[PDB]
Unconditional design. Sequence first.
Lengths: 27, 249, 10
Amino acid sequence: ADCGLRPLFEKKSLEDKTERELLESYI
Amino acid sequence: IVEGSDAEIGMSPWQVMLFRKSPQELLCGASLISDRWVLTAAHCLLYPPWDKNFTENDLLVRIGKHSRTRYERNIEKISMLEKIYIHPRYNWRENLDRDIALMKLKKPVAFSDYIHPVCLPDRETAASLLQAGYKGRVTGWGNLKEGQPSVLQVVNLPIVERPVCKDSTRIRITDNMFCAGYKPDEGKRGDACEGDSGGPFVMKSPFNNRWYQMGIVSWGEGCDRDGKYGFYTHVFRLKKWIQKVIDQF
Amino acid sequence: DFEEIPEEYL
Ligand code: NA
Ligand code: NA
């Protein structure tokens, strides 16, 4: 429900240092 | 985890440590999927060939951790087990098919900046993201080489095409498993290792920017070997059992 | 090798 949203990243709109590598693989 | 990096603080707030009470040691990885349910690998609790069959009372759930060995005062939470649930068709005799189990907590844990549940995928998210080439993220306190880390390790790894999975091993691979990792010719490397078992393989959905646990660390042939891949329990394929267990208990 | 936890947890 509020699952999967990290207090220290998504909930603050901060990105971790390598999550973009995941996005860029998504196609 | 081998060829991984240290985790950022709060980067994997669903990460759980399975902890043996006596002798106090790391047992496996696991994940928080609600305020009183923890997901893990069946083999973390039950594996007769190695004379492993833990009972509730042998175990503790440590949540919100970063440091492997440290008692993280005011941050980690430690919980007792009320009940272990192992998949009734978990195949420990042969290939670790259906390598999944649930743990119900005696009391709900308090969410915090360091403690927060991961989502479990629905059919569409699974169909959308479980594609060869798409990367997932694996986290754990396991071995760094086929020594041990000071803090939680993280590694991102591409899902691999099923024929390449199958052709990499003599084990019989099932639809309840997927494999991930870089190929020898891809340059990059990285893998889960001993100790990482039962931990999560997660993906961040680009549709709603939430993290989903697509797999569970299950088994591998050595760790980070060329031409070998990590094998993960396919969580969506066993979600009916999960829901039923939670729906009933 | 593990720091010991509050006895209360065991
Ligand atoms: Na094969
Ligand atoms: Na490999």
